[PDB]
C-alpha cells in the first residue's frame, strides 16, 4: 500500500544519508591549511561597451576569445568586437522579452529565447549578406531560461515547466526529454567532454544527467533556497552553485557530497552568476548589491571586489584562454576587466 | 590604420541606425493587464479593439497604447515579474459574480517592491447581474461581518472600500471605475489616468519634486 512504499522511500533516504555520512573522513579546510594564500587581486576596467539601452540580460563569449554576444529588453542582439570596440552585426528580434544567449562553438550560429516559449536560431554565414532565422524550435510549455550548443546540429534547452530536452536542429523535434524536477529549471551547464550535464531548479536541488540515455545518476540537496547559477570545475569532477540564500557551495561527483561554503555575515543579497577561472583556483560571483566578489576555491576567503556598476549585475563570463572577464548590468553597460 | 576604416564606417552606420530606432520607439505607452481568471480581460480587449505573452495595441487621440496580457501562462510569478517594471500603470480588473483569491492577488500586486510607485486602475465588471443577484439573494453570505443595508449602492461602495483598503503606500493613487454596459466609455478613464501620470512624471523630471 501507500504506507509501505512511503516507509521504503524513507528507509532508502536514511540509508543513503548514512552511507554519505560514513564515506566522509576529513574536511577540505583542514587539508588545505598547509598552502599559502594568493594575496590581493587589483583587476581594473579596460573597455566599456555602450550600445545597449535597456537592461542587458545575457552574454556569451566566442571560442576565438574576441567576439561577444549580448541581449537586451529593447529587442536587439548585437555582437561586439572586444579588442577594438566595434559592432559587426545587429539582429532584430520579434519579441522583446528575451532571457538567454548562446554562441555556436564553430562561430556559425546564434540562438535566443525568452517568454515566447520558443528557441530560434540565426545564420551568420549567408550568401546574401544578412542574418536570417533558420529554425523555430517550439514545444515547451513554460518560459526558456537557458540554452547551450553541443555542435552545429543539436542543442539542449531548459524551461520553466520542470523539464529539459535535447533537440535536432535539422528536423526540429525533441529527441530526448528529461524529467524529475519538482520546481522550474533556472540554469544549465555542460561538461568539457559534452557527455553529461547538470541543472539547477527552484526546489533547492541539482542533479546530473546523461545525454545518451535520459536518466539521472546523482542528486545534491545542500542548499536552502532556489538555485540560480551552475558551472563545472575545469577538469569536470566538481561544480559550484549559487542561490538566493546569499551563499555558494562546492560539490563533488565521485564522493557525492558538499565540500565548502562561501559566505559572510555582511552580505544578505542573492547571487545572480557564478564562474571559475582558467586554472580553477579563483571563483567569481555576481551579487545584487551592484558589485561582484572573488574568492579562493580552496580556502573560502575573499580576495577582492569588482565594483563599478550602478545596478544589478546579471551576467558574467570568462574567456577560453582565461585572459579577461566580462560583466553586464541592468544599467545597460558592458565592462571588460583584466 | 589599414583599410579597417570601412569597418569603422560600418560600426558608425550601425550606431546611427540604433539611435534612430531608440528615439523612434519611446513614444508608446505600455500597460499591464493583470486580473483573476475569467474576469473580463478578453472582453475588455476585444471591445476596445499565444502560449506565452499576448500583446494588443491601439491608438486613441494621437496616443499609442501597448497592452500586455501575461496571465495566460502558468508558472511562478516572482520569477518574471521583474521584467514588467518601468511600466506606466496596472489595469487590474475585478468581476462581481464570484472572490477572496482576487483580493489576495490585489494585495500581492500592490505591496510589491518593484511596483512601489506604480499607479493602478481598477475595473469592477458585470454590475447589472451583480445587482440582480443581490436582489435575489443577500450579500452577507460572502462577508459575514457586513451589517449594512442590502441596497445596490451601499454594497458596491462597501466592496470598493474593501478592495481599496489593502493599499498601504500613501504616495500612489488607485482609480476605481464601474464599467457597467456603456458605449465604449471606459477608454476615457485610461486616457485621463495616463495623462495625469505623464504630467506628474514630466513635472518630476524637471526637478519640481
Amino acid at each position: 500500500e501507500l504506507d509501505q512504499l512511503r516507509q521504503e522511500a524513507e528507509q532508502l533516504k536514511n540509508q543513503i544519508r548514512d552511507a554519505r555520512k560514513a564515506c566522509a573522513d576529513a574536511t577540505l579546510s583542514q587539508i588545505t591549511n598547509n598552502i599559502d594564500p594568493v594575496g590581493r587581486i587589483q583587476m581594473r576596467t579596460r573597455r566599456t561597451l555602450r550600445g545597449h539601452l535597456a537592461k542587458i540580460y545575457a552574454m556569451h563569449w566566442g571560442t576565438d576569445s574576441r567576439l561577444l554576444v549580448s541581449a537586451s529588453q529593447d529587442g536587439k542582439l548585437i555582437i561586439w568586437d572586444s579588442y577594438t570596440t566595434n559592432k559587426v552585426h545587429a539582429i532584430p528580434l520579434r519579441s522583446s522579452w528575451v532571457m538567454t544567449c548562446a554562441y555556436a562553438p564553430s562561430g556559425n550560429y546564434v540562438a535566443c529565447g525568452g517568454l515566447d516559449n520558443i528557441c530560434s536560431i540565426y545564420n551568420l554565414k549567408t550568401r546574401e549578406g544578412n542574418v536570417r532565422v533558420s529554425r523555430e524550435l517550439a514545444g515547451h510549455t513554460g518560459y526558456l531560461s537557458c540554452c547551450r550548443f553541443l555542435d552545429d546540429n543539436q542543442i539542449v534547452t531548459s524551461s520553466g515547466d520542470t523539464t529539459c530536452a535535447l533537440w535536432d536542429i535539422e528536423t526540429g523535434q525533441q529527441t530526448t526529454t528529461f524529467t524529475g524536477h519538482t520546481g522550474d529549471v533556472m540554469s544549465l551547464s555542460l561538461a568539457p567532454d559534452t557527455r553529461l550535464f547538470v541543472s539547477g531548479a527552484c526546489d533547492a536541488s541539482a542533479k546530473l544527467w546523461d545525454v545518451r540515455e535520459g536518466m539521472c545518476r546523482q542528486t545534491f540537496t545542500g542548499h536552502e533556497s532556489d538555485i540560480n547559477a551552475i558551472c563545472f570545475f575545469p577538469n569536470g569532477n566538481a561544480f559550484a552553485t549559487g542561490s538566493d540564500d546569499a551563499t555558494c557551495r562546492l560539490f563533488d561527483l565521485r564522493a557525492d557530497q558538499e565540500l565548502m561554503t562561501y559566505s559572510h555575515d555582511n552580505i544578505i543579497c542573492g547571487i545572480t552568476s557564478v564562474s571559475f577561472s582558467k586554472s580553477g583556483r579563483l571563483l567569481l560571483a555576481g551579487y545584487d548589491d551592484f558589485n561582484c566578489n572573488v574568492w579562493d576555491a580552496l580556502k573560502a576567503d575573499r580576495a577582492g571586489v569588482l565594483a563599478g556598476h550602478d545596478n544589478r549585475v546579471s551576467c558574467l563570463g570568462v574567456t577560453d584562454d582565461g585572459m579577461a572577464v566580462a560583466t553586464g548590468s541592468w544599467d545597460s553597460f558592458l565592462k571588460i576587466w583584466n | 590604420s589599414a583599410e579597417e576604416r570601412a569597418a569603422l564606417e560600418r560600426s558608425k552606420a550601425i550606431e546611427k541606425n540604433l539611435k534612430e530606432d531608440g528615439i523612434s520607439a519611446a513614444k508608446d505607452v505600455k500597460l499591464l493587464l493583470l486580473g483573476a481568471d475569467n474576469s473580463g480581460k478578453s472582453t475588455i480587449v476585444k471591445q476596445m479593439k499565444t502560449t506565452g505573452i499576448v500583446e494588443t495595441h491601439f491608438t486613441f487621440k494621437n496616443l499609442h497604447f501597448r497592452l500586455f496580457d501575461v496571465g495566460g501562462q502558468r508558472s511562478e510569478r516572482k520569477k518574471w515579474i521583474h521584467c514588467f517594471e518601468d511600466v506606466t500603470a496596472i489595469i487590474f480588473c475585478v468581476d462581481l459574480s464570484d472572490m477572496h483569491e482576487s483580493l489576495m492577488l490585489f494585495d500581492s500586486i500592490c505591496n510589491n517592491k518593484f511596483f512601489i510607485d506604480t499607479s493602478i486602475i481598477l475595473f469592477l465588471n458585470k454590475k447589472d447581474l451583480f445587482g440582480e443577484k443581490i436582489k435575489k439573494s443577500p450579500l452577507t453570505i460572502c462577508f459575514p461581518e457586513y451589517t449594512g443595508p442590502n441596497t445596490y449602492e451601499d454594497a458596491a461602495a462597501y466592496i470598493q472600500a474593501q478592495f481599496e483598503s489593502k493599499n498601504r503606500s500613501p504616495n500612489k493613487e488607485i482609480y476605481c471605475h464601474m464599467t457597467c454596459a456603456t458605449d465604449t466609455n471606459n477608454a476615457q478613464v485610461i486616457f485621463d489616468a495616463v495623462t495625469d501620470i505623464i504630467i506628474a512624471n514630466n513635472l518630476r523630471g524637471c526637478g519640481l519634486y
Partner: single-chain antibody
Amino acid sequence: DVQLVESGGGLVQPGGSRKLSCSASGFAFSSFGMHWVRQAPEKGLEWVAYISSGSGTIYYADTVKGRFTISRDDPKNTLFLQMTSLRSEDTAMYYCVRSIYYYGSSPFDFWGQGTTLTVSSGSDIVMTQATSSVPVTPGESVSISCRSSKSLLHSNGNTYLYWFLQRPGQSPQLLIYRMSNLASGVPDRFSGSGSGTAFTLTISRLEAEDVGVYYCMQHLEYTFGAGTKLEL
C-alpha cells in the same frame, strides 16, 4: 542565384561620352561596396574606381581622375559609371565586382560578366610575377610565386595578398584571401603560403579543369600583377 549584369557597350568615336550600368539582384545591395576592374584585350587587369556602401567615400585611379565618375542608386539596385572625353587607350572590358568589409569578411568574392567598349583609332606598390609560361601534366604539382616591393604585413598581424583564377573565356574567381584562407567553394587541393615579400601558391594533384591564368593582387593601400599561364 546571385547575379551581376552589365550593359551599355558599343563603338564610340574619340572625344565622345558613354555610360555603363551594372544592375544587381539576388543579394542585399545596400550593404556591399562596388569596384570597377578593366583589362585590355591582350593585357592584365587594371583598377578604375570604388564606391562605398552608403556612399561617403570615393576613389579613382591616376589615369582616370577627372574624366570618370561613379554613382549608385540603392532603391533601383543598379550602379552607374559616366565616362567623358574617351581617348584611344580606353578599349577594354569593364567588370563589376563585390566586396563587404568587417572582421572576418572575404571581399572580391563575386565578379560580373562584363561589356566590351571600343574606340576608333585617330608612391605606388609594384607587384611583379616571375614567368609567363609553365607547362605541366595532370597528376603533378606546380608552384606559382609573385613578389612585391614593400612589406604587406601590417602591425595588427594581417598580410594582404589575394589570388585570382581566370579560365579560358570566363570571368575570374577568388581562390585565396589574406595569403592563408581558402575561399568558400575552392577545393582543398589549393593552398597558399608566404612571408614578408615572398609568396607562393601550390596546387597538388593537378586536374584538367584547373588551367588558366593566375593573378596576385595587394590590398594594403589604395594594383594587380602581370599574371602567368599554364598549358597542357
